[PDB]
Amino acid sequence: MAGPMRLYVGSLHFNITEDMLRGIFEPFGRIESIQLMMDSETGRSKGYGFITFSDSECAKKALEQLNGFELAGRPMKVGHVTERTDALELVPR
RNA sequence: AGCUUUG
């Protein structure tokens, strides 16, 4: 099978936690890691986070399965992860 | 800290 795969997770209430995501995506694929985003200034949640799977096809499953799932009643978004530094970084000529 | 939005 393919190697591990990592996805974005969001649209989560602050009431959501890294522990719930552990039970959310695990039955779809063996979880290799999670990183729920938290504020540097207050340590509070951010309502989104990262998660890694043992297989890309198991991540792709938990993707379309939890994509719009009403976790705590709000549809959580899921999708592939990607760089974004080019969205705002710059350098002199 | 509340919302799709990304290390």
GROMACS .gro file of N, CA and C (backbone and C1' of nucleotides) in nm:
model
  327
    1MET      N    1   0.084  -0.121   0.000
    1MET     CA    2   0.000   0.000   0.000
    1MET      C    3   0.087   0.125   0.000
    2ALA      N    4   0.025   0.241  -0.025
    2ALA     CA    5   0.095   0.369  -0.028
    2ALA      C    6   0.143   0.409   0.112
    3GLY      N    7   0.230   0.510   0.118
    3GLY     CA    8   0.280   0.564   0.243
    3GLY      C    9   0.174   0.647   0.316
    4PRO      N   10   0.211   0.712   0.426
    4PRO     CA   11   0.121   0.795   0.504
    4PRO      C   12   0.074   0.916   0.424
    5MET      N   13  -0.031   0.981   0.475
    5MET     CA   14  -0.093   1.097   0.412
    5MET      C   15  -0.146   1.189   0.521
    6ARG      N   16  -0.146   1.320   0.496
    6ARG     CA   17  -0.185   1.418   0.596
    6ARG      C   18  -0.289   1.513   0.538
    7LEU      N   19  -0.389   1.547   0.620
    7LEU     CA   20  -0.502   1.628   0.577
    7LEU      C   21  -0.522   1.748   0.669
    8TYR      N   22  -0.597   1.846   0.619
    8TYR     CA   23  -0.646   1.958   0.698
    8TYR      C   24  -0.783   1.921   0.754
    9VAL      N   25  -0.814   1.973   0.873
    9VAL     CA   26  -0.944   1.956   0.937
    9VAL      C   27  -0.985   2.092   0.991
   10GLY      N   28  -1.111   2.131   0.973
   10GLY     CA   29  -1.157   2.261   1.019
   10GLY      C   30  -1.308   2.271   1.024
   11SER      N   31  -1.358   2.392   1.050
   11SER     CA   32  -1.500   2.416   1.075
   11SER      C   33  -1.545   2.351   1.207
   12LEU      N   34  -1.448   2.314   1.291
   12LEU     CA   35  -1.470   2.258   1.423
   12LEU      C   36  -1.501   2.368   1.524
   13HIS      N   37  -1.594   2.344   1.617
   13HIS     CA   38  -1.614   2.437   1.726
   13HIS      C   39  -1.490   2.436   1.816
   14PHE      N   40  -1.471   2.538   1.901
   14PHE     CA   41  -1.363   2.534   1.998
   14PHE      C   42  -1.388   2.420   2.097
   15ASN      N   43  -1.515   2.379   2.108
   15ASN     CA   44  -1.553   2.266   2.192
   15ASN      C   45  -1.492   2.135   2.142
   16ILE      N   46  -1.442   2.131   2.017
   16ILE     CA   47  -1.377   2.013   1.962
   16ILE      C   48  -1.234   2.004   2.014
   17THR      N   49  -1.179   1.883   2.019
   17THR     CA   50  -1.045   1.860   2.072
   17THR      C   51  -0.971   1.758   1.987
   18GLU      N   52  -0.839   1.750   2.010
   18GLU     CA   53  -0.751   1.658   1.939
   18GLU      C   54  -0.787   1.513   1.972
   19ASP      N   55  -0.849   1.493   2.089
   19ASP     CA   56  -0.892   1.362   2.135
   19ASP      C   57  -1.013   1.313   2.058
   20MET      N   58  -1.108   1.402   2.027
   20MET     CA   59  -1.223   1.362   1.949
   20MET      C   60  -1.180   1.322   1.810
   21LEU      N   61  -1.096   1.403   1.745
   21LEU     CA   62  -1.047   1.370   1.612
   21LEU      C   63  -0.978   1.234   1.614
   22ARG      N   64  -0.917   1.196   1.727
   22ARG     CA   65  -0.853   1.066   1.736
   22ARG      C   66  -0.957   0.956   1.715
   23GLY      N   67  -1.077   0.972   1.772
   23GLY     CA   68  -1.183   0.874   1.758
   23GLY      C   69  -1.264   0.893   1.630
   24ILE      N   70  -1.253   1.009   1.565
   24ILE     CA   71  -1.327   1.039   1.443
   24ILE      C   72  -1.265   0.971   1.322
   25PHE      N   73  -1.133   0.984   1.306
   25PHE     CA   74  -1.065   0.939   1.185
   25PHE      C   75  -1.001   0.801   1.200
   26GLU      N   76  -0.983   0.753   1.323
   26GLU     CA   77  -0.921   0.624   1.348
   26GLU      C   78  -0.995   0.505   1.285
   27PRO      N   79  -1.129   0.496   1.294
   27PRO     CA   80  -1.203   0.384   1.235
   27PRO      C   81  -1.194   0.383   1.082
   28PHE      N   82  -1.145   0.491   1.020
   28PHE     CA   83  -1.130   0.498   0.876
   28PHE      C   84  -0.987   0.467   0.831
   29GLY      N   85  -0.890   0.483   0.922
   29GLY     CA   86  -0.749   0.464   0.891
   29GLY      C   87  -0.667   0.479   1.018
   30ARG      N   88  -0.556   0.405   1.029
   30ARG     CA   89  -0.473   0.413   1.149
   30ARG      C   90  -0.413   0.552   1.156
   31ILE      N   91  -0.438   0.624   1.266
   31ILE     CA   92  -0.387   0.760   1.281
   31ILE      C   93  -0.238   0.755   1.315
   32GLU      N   94  -0.157   0.827   1.238
   32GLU     CA   95  -0.013   0.834   1.259
   32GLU      C   96   0.023   0.956   1.344
   33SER      N   97  -0.056   1.064   1.335
   33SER     CA   98  -0.033   1.183   1.416
   33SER      C   99  -0.150   1.279   1.406
   34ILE      N  100  -0.157   1.374   1.500
   34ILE     CA  101  -0.254   1.483   1.498
   34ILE      C  102  -0.187   1.608   1.555
   35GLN      N  103  -0.230   1.725   1.507
   35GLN     CA  104  -0.183   1.854   1.553
   35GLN      C  105  -0.297   1.955   1.545
   36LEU      N  106  -0.380   1.959   1.649
   36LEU     CA  107  -0.489   2.055   1.658
   36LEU      C  108  -0.427   2.192   1.678
   37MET      N  109  -0.468   2.290   1.598
   37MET     CA  110  -0.411   2.422   1.604
   37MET      C  111  -0.457   2.495   1.730
   38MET      N  112  -0.364   2.568   1.792
   38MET     CA  113  -0.389   2.641   1.915
   38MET      C  114  -0.316   2.775   1.909
   39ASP      N  115  -0.375   2.877   1.973
   39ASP     CA  116  -0.321   3.012   1.972
   39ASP      C  117  -0.188   3.017   2.046
   40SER      N  118  -0.090   3.089   1.992
   40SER     CA  119   0.039   3.106   2.058
   40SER      C  120   0.026   3.202   2.176
   41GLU      N  121  -0.068   3.296   2.166
   41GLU     CA  122  -0.080   3.404   2.262
   41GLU      C  123  -0.170   3.368   2.381
   42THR      N  124  -0.262   3.272   2.364
   42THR     CA  125  -0.358   3.238   2.468
   42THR      C  126  -0.370   3.087   2.492
   43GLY      N  127  -0.314   3.005   2.403
   43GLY     CA  128  -0.319   2.860   2.418
   43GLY      C  129  -0.457   2.801   2.387
   44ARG      N  130  -0.554   2.885   2.349
   44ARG     CA  131  -0.689   2.841   2.318
   44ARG      C  132  -0.691   2.766   2.185
   45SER      N  133  -0.803   2.700   2.156
   45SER     CA  134  -0.822   2.626   2.032
   45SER      C  135  -0.820   2.721   1.912
   46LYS      N  136  -0.830   2.668   1.789
   46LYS     CA  137  -0.844   2.750   1.670
   46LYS      C  138  -0.958   2.701   1.580
   47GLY      N  139  -1.021   2.588   1.614
   47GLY     CA  140  -1.132   2.534   1.536
   47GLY      C  141  -1.087   2.463   1.409
   48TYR      N  142  -0.957   2.435   1.396
   48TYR     CA  143  -0.903   2.354   1.288
   48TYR      C  144  -0.772   2.290   1.334
   49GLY      N  145  -0.723   2.191   1.259
   49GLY     CA  146  -0.605   2.117   1.297
   49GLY      C  147  -0.563   2.017   1.190
   50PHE      N  148  -0.446   1.957   1.210
   50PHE     CA  149  -0.385   1.866   1.114
   50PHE      C  150  -0.391   1.723   1.166
   51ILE      N  151  -0.385   1.626   1.074
   51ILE     CA  152  -0.394   1.485   1.109
   51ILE      C  153  -0.330   1.399   1.000
   52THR      N  154  -0.261   1.292   1.041
   52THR     CA  155  -0.187   1.205   0.949
   52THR      C  156  -0.236   1.061   0.961
   53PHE      N  157  -0.235   0.989   0.849
   53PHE     CA  158  -0.286   0.854   0.838
   53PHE      C  159  -0.177   0.757   0.793
   54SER      N  160  -0.199   0.628   0.814
   54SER     CA  161  -0.106   0.522   0.780
   54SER      C  162  -0.106   0.491   0.630
   55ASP      N  163  -0.210   0.535   0.559
   55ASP     CA  164  -0.228   0.508   0.417
   55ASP      C  165  -0.305   0.623   0.353
   56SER      N  166  -0.272   0.657   0.228
   56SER     CA  167  -0.338   0.766   0.159
   56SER      C  168  -0.482   0.729   0.126
   57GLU      N  169  -0.510   0.601   0.102
   57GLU     CA  170  -0.644   0.559   0.065
   57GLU      C  171  -0.735   0.557   0.187
   58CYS      N  172  -0.677   0.543   0.306
   58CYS     CA  173  -0.752   0.549   0.431
   58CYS      C  174  -0.774   0.694   0.472
   59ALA      N  175  -0.687   0.785   0.428
   59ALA     CA  176  -0.702   0.927   0.456
   59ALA      C  177  -0.808   0.983   0.361
   60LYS      N  178  -0.801   0.940   0.235
   60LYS     CA  179  -0.895   0.976   0.131
   60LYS      C  180  -1.036   0.929   0.164
   61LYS      N  181  -1.048   0.819   0.239
   61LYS     CA  182  -1.178   0.770   0.283
   61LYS      C  183  -1.230   0.859   0.396
   62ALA      N  184  -1.153   0.873   0.504
   62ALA     CA  185  -1.193   0.957   0.616
   62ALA      C  186  -1.214   1.101   0.572
   63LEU      N  187  -1.153   1.140   0.460
   63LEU     CA  188  -1.172   1.272   0.401
   63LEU      C  189  -1.317   1.287   0.359
   64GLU      N  190  -1.360   1.214   0.256
   64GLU     CA  191  -1.493   1.232   0.201
   64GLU      C  192  -1.602   1.187   0.298
   65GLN      N  193  -1.567   1.107   0.399
   65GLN     CA  194  -1.662   1.061   0.498
   65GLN      C  195  -1.689   1.166   0.605
   66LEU      N  196  -1.585   1.234   0.653
   66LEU     CA  197  -1.603   1.337   0.755
   66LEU      C  198  -1.619   1.475   0.692
   67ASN      N  199  -1.598   1.486   0.560
   67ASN     CA  200  -1.617   1.610   0.487
   67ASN      C  201  -1.765   1.649   0.495
   68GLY      N  202  -1.794   1.746   0.582
   68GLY     CA  203  -1.928   1.797   0.608
   68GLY      C  204  -2.001   1.722   0.719
   69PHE      N  205  -1.930   1.639   0.797
   69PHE     CA  206  -1.990   1.570   0.910
   69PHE      C  207  -2.018   1.669   1.022
   70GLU      N  208  -2.142   1.671   1.072
   70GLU     CA  209  -2.184   1.760   1.179
   70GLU      C  210  -2.125   1.720   1.314
   71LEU      N  211  -1.993   1.734   1.329
   71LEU     CA  212  -1.928   1.713   1.457
   71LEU      C  213  -1.970   1.830   1.545
   72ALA      N  214  -2.024   1.802   1.664
   72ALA     CA  215  -2.082   1.903   1.751
   72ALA      C  216  -2.189   1.986   1.679
   73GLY      N  217  -2.244   1.933   1.569
   73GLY     CA  218  -2.354   1.996   1.497
   73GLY      C  219  -2.311   2.087   1.383
   74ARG      N  220  -2.181   2.114   1.367
   74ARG     CA  221  -2.134   2.192   1.253
   74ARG      C  222  -2.052   2.103   1.160
   75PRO      N  223  -2.079   2.107   1.029
   75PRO     CA  224  -2.010   2.026   0.931
   75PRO      C  225  -1.860   2.059   0.930
   76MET      N  226  -1.777   1.962   0.969
   76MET     CA  227  -1.633   1.978   0.968
   76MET      C  228  -1.583   1.962   0.826
   77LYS      N  229  -1.489   2.047   0.785
   77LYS     CA  230  -1.431   2.036   0.652
   77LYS      C  231  -1.303   1.953   0.660
   78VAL      N  232  -1.277   1.876   0.554
   78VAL     CA  233  -1.156   1.797   0.543
   78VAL      C  234  -1.105   1.809   0.400
   79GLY      N  235  -0.974   1.797   0.380
   79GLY     CA  236  -0.916   1.803   0.247
   79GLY      C  237  -0.765   1.792   0.254
   80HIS      N  238  -0.700   1.784   0.137
   80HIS     CA  239  -0.556   1.767   0.131
   80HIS      C  240  -0.486   1.892   0.181
   81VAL      N  241  -0.366   1.872   0.236
   81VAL     CA  242  -0.288   1.979   0.296
   81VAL      C  243  -0.190   2.035   0.194
   82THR      N  244  -0.136   2.156   0.217
   82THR     CA  245  -0.056   2.224   0.115
   82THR      C  246   0.017   2.344   0.173
   83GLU      N  247   0.127   2.382   0.108
   83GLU     CA  248   0.203   2.502   0.142
   83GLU      C  249   0.118   2.627   0.118
   84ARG      N  250   0.153   2.737   0.186
   84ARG     CA  251   0.078   2.861   0.176
   84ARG      C  252   0.167   2.982   0.206
   85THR      N  253   0.298   2.962   0.218
   85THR     CA  254   0.391   3.070   0.248
   85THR      C  255   0.395   3.172   0.135
   86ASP      N  256   0.371   3.128   0.012
   86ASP     CA  257   0.375   3.214  -0.105
   86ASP      C  258   0.253   3.307  -0.111
   87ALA      N  259   0.158   3.291  -0.017
   87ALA     CA  260   0.038   3.372  -0.014
   87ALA      C  261   0.064   3.511   0.042
   88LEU      N  262   0.176   3.530   0.114
   88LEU     CA  263   0.201   3.658   0.178
   88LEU      C  264   0.350   3.690   0.195
   89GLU      N  265   0.439   3.594   0.175
   89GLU     CA  266   0.582   3.621   0.189
   89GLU      C  267   0.634   3.698   0.067
   90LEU      N  268   0.744   3.771   0.085
   90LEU     CA  269   0.806   3.851  -0.020
   90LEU      C  270   0.955   3.871   0.009
   91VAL      N  271   1.028   3.924  -0.089
   91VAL     CA  272   1.170   3.950  -0.075
   91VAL      C  273   1.209   4.065  -0.169
   92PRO      N  274   1.302   4.153  -0.129
   92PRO     CA  275   1.350   4.263  -0.212
   92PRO      C  276   1.409   4.215  -0.344
   93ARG      N  277   1.411   4.304  -0.444
   93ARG     CA  278   1.465   4.274  -0.576
   93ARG      C  279   1.617   4.262  -0.570
   94A      O5'  280  -1.382   3.502   2.328
   94A      C5'  281  -1.385   3.437   2.202
   94A      C4'  282  -1.269   3.486   2.115
   94A      C3'  283  -1.262   3.405   1.986
   94A      O3'  284  -1.270   3.488   1.871
   94A      C1'  285  -1.084   3.350   2.138
   95G        P  286  -1.411   3.545   1.819
   95G      O5'  287  -1.471   3.421   1.734
   95G      C5'  288  -1.414   3.386   1.610
   95G      C4'  289  -1.487   3.268   1.546
   95G      C3'  290  -1.638   3.291   1.529
   95G      O3'  291  -1.674   3.286   1.393
   95G      C1'  292  -1.585   3.073   1.599
   96C        P  293  -1.663   3.415   1.299
   96C      O5'  294  -1.633   3.352   1.154
   96C      C5'  295  -1.504   3.304   1.121
   96C      C4'  296  -1.502   3.151   1.108
   96C      C3'  297  -1.610   3.098   1.014
   96C      O3'  298  -1.574   3.105   0.878
   96C      C1'  299  -1.536   2.949   1.186
   97U        P  300  -1.686   3.096   0.762
   97U      O5'  301  -1.602   3.064   0.628
   97U      C5'  302  -1.598   2.934   0.572
   97U      C4'  303  -1.524   2.833   0.660
   97U      C3'  304  -1.376   2.869   0.675
   97U      O3'  305  -1.341   2.925   0.800
   97U      C1'  306  -1.401   2.663   0.563
   98U        P  307  -1.211   3.019   0.813
   98U      O5'  308  -1.087   2.927   0.766
   98U      C5'  309  -0.999   2.867   0.860
   98U      C4'  310  -0.868   2.822   0.793
   98U      C3'  311  -0.814   2.928   0.697
   98U      O3'  312  -0.674   2.923   0.677
   98U      C1'  313  -0.855   2.732   0.583
   99U        P  314  -0.568   2.916   0.798
   99U      O5'  315  -0.538   2.757   0.804
   99U      C5'  316  -0.448   2.702   0.898
   99U      C4'  317  -0.342   2.616   0.828
   99U      C3'  318  -0.265   2.696   0.723
   99U      O3'  319  -0.128   2.659   0.724
   99U      C1'  320  -0.356   2.504   0.627
  100G        P  321  -0.025   2.720   0.831
  100G      O5'  322   0.038   2.591   0.906
  100G      C5'  323  -0.013   2.545   1.030
  100G      C4'  324   0.069   2.428   1.086
  100G      C3'  325   0.218   2.458   1.094
  100G      O3'  326   0.274   2.384   1.200
  100G      C1'  327   0.175   2.292   0.929
   0.00000   0.00000   0.00000
